[PDB]
Structure 1
């Protein structure tokens, strides 16, 4: 059982990726901001963060993240534009958008993102080298992105 969301006859399109090589913290925020958006609006919004026109609000992991003007509306002064995460979240959304529309024969407007669970995953552990004969670590933080488009909220 890999998929957290239980549809129980909700006519949804679900696409996921496992151990995507991005930061868990940055991807989590991109998915949370996307939640509730129209599928088309989400595509435009994610293109805008890549173009720096719109910011991704950092509602959870915000310490050390800079306040910007673009995040004034979202209710959090803090925000960041995560480019690598945006590519992955758009790609995962694209597979869900196609899968719901092919499987449930639903027009793109009806589909809206409804669920966003992202779980931290096991990562590589490259060693770092420090002073006084110390060997440290540069462990990665991959995540399992699961994004589900759906009929209505």
Structure 2
């Protein structure tokens, strides 16, 4: 439902495709504020981003790494999505990343296109 969701897209970025995909998977489905806090902690090396497909530490209990370069772009895109939602007048607290995808961009380095969508959780329902 467009009336309850916001979108943000980044194309032709130079971040590593595999690392970006791992970061997106590690953040898919998380709450917007919680996702931002997790990314900030990752930048602080307190938590690590799991690498389940493209690959041993205690941080991986929740095989992990700290892709700072990819995380920077991921958090920038998340901030852009939050700004779009604010422009749309959505409730930031209820916002959660419902869709996130990475696509290989034209070729050298391996650029990729990253797009994410945030949707408002349904609550306050009664007879």
Structure-1-length-normalised TM-score: 0.75
**Matched pairs, number:** 122
1:95 is aligned to 80
User: Which consecutive aligned stretches of 4+ in structure 1 deviate over 3 angstroms post-superposition?
Assistant: none
Counterpart-to-counterpart distance in 2, 1:148 and 1:68? 31
Aligned partners of 2:14 and 2:39: how far apart in 1?
19
Q: Contact 1:10 / 1:150 at 8 angstroms: preserved in 2?
A: no
Higher helix share: 2
How well do the aligned residues superpose, as a CA RMSD in angstroms? 1.5
Is the contact between residue 4 and residue 90 of structure 2 (CA under 8 Å) also seen in structure 1? no
Change beyond 3 A, Cα 1:109–1:121: same
- TM-superposed CA distance for 1:69, in Å, is 1.4
Name the residue aligned to 2:36: 43
In the alignment, structure 1 segments of 5+ residues that lack a partner are 1-7, 124-138
Mark the runs of 5 or more structure 2 residues left unpaired by the alignment: 123-127
Give the TM-score taking structure 2 as reference length.
0.89
Question: Which residue in the other structure is 1:23 paired with?
Answer: 16
